[PDB]
Ligand binder design. Structure first.
Ligand SMILES: [Mg+2]
Ligand SMILES: [Mg+2]
Ligand SMILES: [Mg+2]
Ligand SMILES: [Mg+2]
Ligand SMILES: [Mg+2]
Ligand SMILES: [Mg+2]
Ligand SMILES: [Mg+2]
Ligand SMILES: [Mg+2]
Ligand SMILES: [Mg+2]
Ligand SMILES: [Mg+2]
Ligand SMILES: [Mg+2]
Ligand SMILES: [Mg+2]
Ligand SMILES: [Mg+2]
Ligand SMILES: [Mg+2]
Ligand SMILES: [Mg+2]
Ligand SMILES: [Mg+2]
Ligand SMILES: [Mg+2]
Ligand SMILES: [Mg+2]
Ligand SMILES: [Mg+2]
Ligand SMILES: [Mg+2]
Ligand SMILES: [Mg+2]
Ligand SMILES: [Mg+2]
Ligand SMILES: [Mg+2]
Ligand SMILES: [Mg+2]
Ligand SMILES: [Mg+2]
Ligand SMILES: [Mg+2]
Ligand SMILES: [Mg+2]
Ligand SMILES: [Mg+2]
Ligand SMILES: [Mg+2]
Ligand SMILES: [Mg+2]
Ligand SMILES: [Mg+2]
Ligand SMILES: [Mg+2]
Ligand SMILES: [Mg+2]
Ligand SMILES: [Mg+2]
Ligand SMILES: [Mg+2]
Ligand SMILES: [Mg+2]
Ligand SMILES: [Mg+2]
Ligand SMILES: [Mg+2]
Ligand SMILES: [Mg+2]
Ligand SMILES: [Mg+2]
Ligand SMILES: [Mg+2]
Ligand SMILES: [Mg+2]
Ligand SMILES: [Mg+2]
Ligand SMILES: [Mg+2]
Ligand SMILES: [Mg+2]
Ligand SMILES: [Mg+2]
Ligand SMILES: [Mg+2]
Ligand SMILES: [Mg+2]
Ligand SMILES: [Mg+2]
Ligand SMILES: [Mg+2]
Ligand SMILES: [Mg+2]
Ligand SMILES: [Mg+2]
Ligand SMILES: [Mg+2]
Ligand SMILES: [Mg+2]
Ligand SMILES: [Mg+2]
Ligand SMILES: [Mg+2]
Ligand SMILES: [Mg+2]
Ligand SMILES: [Mg+2]
Ligand SMILES: [Mg+2]
Ligand SMILES: [Mg+2]
Ligand SMILES: [Mg+2]
Ligand SMILES: [Mg+2]
Ligand SMILES: [Mg+2]
Ligand SMILES: [Mg+2]
Ligand SMILES: [Mg+2]
Ligand SMILES: [Mg+2]
Ligand SMILES: [Mg+2]
Ligand SMILES: [Mg+2]
Ligand SMILES: [Mg+2]
Ligand SMILES: [Mg+2]
Ligand SMILES: [Mg+2]
Lengths: 136, 74, 55, 104, 180
RNA sequence: ACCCCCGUGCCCAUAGCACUGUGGAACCACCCCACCCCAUGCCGAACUGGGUCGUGAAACACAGCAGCGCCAAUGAUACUCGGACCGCAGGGUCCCGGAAAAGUCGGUCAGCGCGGGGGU
RNA sequence: GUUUGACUGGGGCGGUCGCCUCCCAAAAUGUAACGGAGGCGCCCAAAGGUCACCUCAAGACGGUUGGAAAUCGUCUGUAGAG
RNA sequence: UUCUCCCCGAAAUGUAUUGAGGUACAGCCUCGGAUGUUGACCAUGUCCUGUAGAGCACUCACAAGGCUAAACCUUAUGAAACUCCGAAGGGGCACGCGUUUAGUCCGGGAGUGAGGCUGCGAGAGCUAACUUCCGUAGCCGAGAGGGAAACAACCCAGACCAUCAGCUAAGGUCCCUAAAUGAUCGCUCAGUGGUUAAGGAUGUGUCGUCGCAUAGACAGCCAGGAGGUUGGCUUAGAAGCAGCCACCCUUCAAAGAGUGCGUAAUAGCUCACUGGUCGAGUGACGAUGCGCCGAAAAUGAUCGGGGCU
């Protein structure tokens, strides 16, 4: 979620997913197909959603995380400066990036627990399995 | 805030291969970015200038190994 | 080679303009013979989409 | 420490001067003073305490200083030159200078 | 398993299912074009855990082990597939998955067996006999137990690639909470 | 000419470090003592100065060694000049040359001079 | 008899005017916004001239009213200091 | 702010201004003299650069562990104000290895100093605006002609004059209008074409991954579907099925301490699985082409219309 001290501001641009893998930290994982921002909530609700459908088990891994601060109209117009320091925090994700990963649950077990968290997400997604093994 | 100030114009004035005169300015940069080589002087502001007329040439490998030098023609 | 000017210079970027002039083609439909040389082939390879080069 | 020498060796901007470099190097009670062409990759006129025991007391550098001074003066070549090293002035090293300078 | 044509020409590839690739022993390397269909039907059976034979058009059979594979984001299918060679009994270190056989009595205790790391690099000797898997007995460990890399069985003198004390399998405790 | 040592360059880690083995009256080094030259804001440790024995220990010098460093392909990709496009938009594609970073295969524990002292 | 500034997503209220540094700035220079951060209106008779020598931050071990931190010792120490 | 034809032909940027819709200077236009390829494009050669991308070696941030809370190790990331690195392009100089035709200086006269749109690169904005502010190309501006129904900017294209002549560009060739109700192979039953999305579906067409075949599976129909037993905890009781913990054993051609329905609780009815009866395929995940639903705003409707399978 919202983090400790920073640079405090940003603009915006979009490429393709750089540091997201295919797999990591578990059997099954979740992958975003569309460039977008994810907020402090969303993924926070996604954790809660997924975990609710589990035993509550601590087997869930979230590779994503909010860094980028966003802003908003104090009330209205253009009068004055750029403003809105805390409105919300976002985490940019690009396609192919892996978002969440789970541990030790079965096939349908994590299929449905990803599906529940599929909603609450501004983008379409697909879960996965491991073939490419890369650790270095 | 709104307070940023001035252009400052630092550059490499005469690039390698070029024919300098005596007193021409070869580089404008900040502290050490280029080291004065053979036939090249340096001022208060750093900023290499030409000691002797001729052809200017760049020499570097890595780091602070960058050098600007002159040689005559005839 | 063999060069001819089909698409015009209206609405095209600046450098390509001068090069149409360089090759000496003024009206479209124009055609002229050219040498095989480093600087000339580079002048057609610049504007290649504006010309049908016969061979 | 080992930058003692390289403070001095770089202290003399070499080919910008137009002069030559004279490297005095002391190790034992013997000194070897040699003169080098800076621009070119070469050396000019050697001296030594090696074939010596001219004087008994180091300050036999007087001999090798005058030995270089004469050995060089056959090639012509006298202006200032004069490198030095980690070693200070006066004493044993200035017995070499005044043997060359004013002695050459 | 097999390939015929392997040109430098790029656009002859995706007209059929084929992956742009290479192979090298350091004595030589060369152009590659490999059928994708039977490849991921093959690599699936093998990975880095073992080598398979290659037959190029022109009657040349050189046995090789899969090394690194560059995957396309936004898709499943791979775009690259690097290959390496075999010189017995020296050859390069091989990544070995941790399969965790038997049910621990600590998973019965309300915990979960979790493998911190898989595909251990190790090495040696024969790349005929390569360790295509790694058997690790977990019935001994219960809760809070961290099985390190010095406890892992690797027959025929296969030296550990990483630190001996590096944690591979650790069973994680049951979910706990106290304060409101 | 060759072996090697002392000096001093060019190059300006593929020439660097640690593990380590050879080296000793010829060269280097420590060691030796120093009221004064000279000098440590305390100590001659450092400069400095007077000289052997000893020692080859330290420092230095060369040979070894590819564990670490440093250099590092070919393949593919990212991106992109130019051409031609799809999407309400975030964004994406096709052709055309150009073409990285990382990673792997590997490659190394340098090269090239000037002068002088000493063995053959 | 006259004066009572401008900027300004209308004017006013608020803020802002000159100077230095970074980002914006699209690998030349240049480049705007009431865009994103921060400083200046000094000091230094030695913090200058030159001439010589000197090498830092930090960690670990061991050490005395002194322990997070001190002062000393050895080791590490392309700069992690100034 | 009044008579004609001809030649050229801009500017809405910079800097400063009691300056902001005004002036000065420079930039851009023209006339004349001088000079004379010095201009232009493109190619080679050579230097300069830190964005794109990438990458943690520095600074800030940050995911899961290991270790005895910083450091440290395995694994893993973000970055306008981070950089171990780093293009494509861009800039200067030299050369003309080869095509072109401008360029500079001196002097007379100006105007413009309110710009606009689109694509690309950013900021601000809400990754809103026929927004706002810079960069960059092209057009309108000052541009007629063809196209986009109408339509500054978009696509194709720069109008010296005449012709009841010819070839093409963008776009088109059923009728309203010119011109194939052309051809070959597909696709779409929606008027989709000719209103947007999350999400949803045995709509169809091309590929793919698998698992059960005549040793008779998927459906259909006949029965069986049993034994500790009401597994323990908890609740007014909870006996497969409120519910948290667990989910072993017996019999067997085979039957989960069990999937749905049911009761206040067991009963009661099917499935899971076995046997029989009958025939040849049948079931499950993703990829893709084109469709479906999702799809409500105010005077009368419609793709320009007629109309089109
Ligand atoms: Mg963008
Ligand atoms: Mg990476
Ligand atoms: Mg600036
Ligand atoms: Mg270098
Ligand atoms: Mg030496
Ligand atoms: Mg001897
Ligand atoms: Mg001593
Ligand atoms: Mg040693
Ligand atoms: Mg390559
Ligand atoms: Mg791509
Ligand atoms: Mg393009
Ligand atoms: Mg469009
Ligand atoms: Mg793209
Ligand atoms: Mg091109
Ligand atoms: Mg390309
Ligand atoms: Mg290339
Ligand atoms: Mg590389
Ligand atoms: Mg390697
Ligand atoms: Mg060595
Ligand atoms: Mg020699
Ligand atoms: Mg006003
Ligand atoms: Mg206002
Ligand atoms: Mg006003
Ligand atoms: Mg203010
Ligand atoms: Mg710039
Ligand atoms: Mg630029
Ligand atoms: Mg401007
Ligand atoms: Mg501004
Ligand atoms: Mg801003
Ligand atoms: Mg005209
Ligand atoms: Mg000013
Ligand atoms: Mg004017
Ligand atoms: Mg004129
Ligand atoms: Mg006249
Ligand atoms: Mg000419
Ligand atoms: Mg010129
Ligand atoms: Mg020219
Ligand atoms: Mg950057
Ligand atoms: Mg980037
Ligand atoms: Mg940067
Ligand atoms: Mg590297
Ligand atoms: Mg370059
Ligand atoms: Mg005038
Ligand atoms: Mg007039
Ligand atoms: Mg006037
Ligand atoms: Mg004005
Ligand atoms: Mg204006
Ligand atoms: Mg403007
Ligand atoms: Mg914003
Ligand atoms: Mg506007
Ligand atoms: Mg106007
Ligand atoms: Mg028009
Ligand atoms: Mg115009
Ligand atoms: Mg028109
Ligand atoms: Mg019309
Ligand atoms: Mg229209
Ligand atoms: Mg319009
Ligand atoms: Mg008009
Ligand atoms: Mg176009
Ligand atoms: Mg005309
Ligand atoms: Mg016609
Ligand atoms: Mg056409
Ligand atoms: Mg008709
Ligand atoms: Mg027809
Ligand atoms: Mg959908
Ligand atoms: Mg059925
Ligand atoms: Mg019940
Ligand atoms: Mg309830
Ligand atoms: Mg259950
Ligand atoms: Mg019953
Ligand atoms: Mg029945």
């Amino acid at each position: 979620k919202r983090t400790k001290f920073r640079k405090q501001f940003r603009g915006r641009m979009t490429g393709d997913a750089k540091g997201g893998d295919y797999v990591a930290f578990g059997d099954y994982g979740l992958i975003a197909m569309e460039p977008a921002w994810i907020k402090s909530n969303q993924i926070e609700a996604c954790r809660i959603v997924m975990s609710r459908h589990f035993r509550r088990g601590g087997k869930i891994y979230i590779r994503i995380f909010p860094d980028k601060p966003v802003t908003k109209k104090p009330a209205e117009t253009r009068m004055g400066k750029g403003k809105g320091a805390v409105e919300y925090w976002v985490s940019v994700v690009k396609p192919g990036r892996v978002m969440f990963e789970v541990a030790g649950v079965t096939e349908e077990q994590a299929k449905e627990a990803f599906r529940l968290a599929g909603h609450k997400l501004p983008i379409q997604t697909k879960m996965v399995k491991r073939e490419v093994y890369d650790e270095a | 805030n709104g307070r940023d100030s001035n252009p400052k114009y630092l550059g490499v004035k005469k690039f390698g291969g070029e024919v300098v005169k005596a007193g021409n300015i070869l580089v404008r940069q900040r502290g050490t970015k280029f080291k004065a080589g053979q036939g090249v002087g340096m001022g208060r502001d750093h900023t290499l200038f030409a000691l002797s007329d001729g052809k200017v040439v760049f020499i570097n490998k890595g780091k602070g190994a960058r050098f600007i030098s002159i040689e005559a023609a005839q | 080679m063999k060069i001819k000017l089909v698409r015009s210079v209206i609405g095209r970027p600046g450098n390509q303009v001068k090069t149409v002039q360089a090759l000496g083609l003024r009206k479209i439909g124009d055609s002229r013979e050219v040498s095989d040389t480093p600087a000339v082939r580079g002048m057609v390879k610049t504007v290649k989409h504006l010309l049908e080069v016969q061979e | 420490r080992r930058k003692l020498r390289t403070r001095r060796k770089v202290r003399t901007t070499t080919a910008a001067s137009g002069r030559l470099r004279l490297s005095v190097y002391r190790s034992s009670k013997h000194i070897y003073a040699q003169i080098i062409d800076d621009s070119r990759g070469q050396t000019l006129a050697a001296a030594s305490s090696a074939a010596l025991k001219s004087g008994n007391k180091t300050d036999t550098a007087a001999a090798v200083g005058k030995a270089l001074a004469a050995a060089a003066a056959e090639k012509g070549i006298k202006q200032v030159v004069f490198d030095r090293g980690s070693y200070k002035y006066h004493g044993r090293v200035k017995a070499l200078a005044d043997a060359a300078r004013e002695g050459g | 398993m097999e390939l015929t044509a392997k040109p430098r020409t790029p656009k002859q590839k995706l007209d059929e299912s084929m992956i742009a690739a290479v192979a090298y022993n350091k004595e030589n390397n060369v152009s590659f074009a490999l059928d994708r269909k039977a490849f991921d039907r093959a690599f699936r059976q093998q990975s880095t855990t073992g080598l398979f034979d290659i037959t190029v058009e022109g009657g040349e059979t050189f046995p090789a082990l899969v090394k690194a594979v560059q995957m396309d984001k936004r898709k499943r299918a791979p775009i690259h597939v690097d290959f390496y060679m075999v010189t017995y009994g020296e050859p390069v270190e091989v990544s070995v998955p941790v399969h965790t056989t038997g049910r621990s009595q600590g998973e019965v205790q309300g915990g979960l067996v979790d493998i911190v790391v898989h595909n251990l690099q190790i090495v040696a000797p024969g790349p005929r006999r390569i360790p295509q898997e790694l058997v690790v007995d977990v019935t001994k460990m219960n809760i809070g137990d961290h099985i390190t890399a010095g406890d892992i069985k690797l027959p025929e003198g296969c030296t550990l690639a990483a630190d001996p004390e590096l944690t591979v399998v650790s069973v994680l405790p049951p979910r706990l909470t106290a304060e409101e």
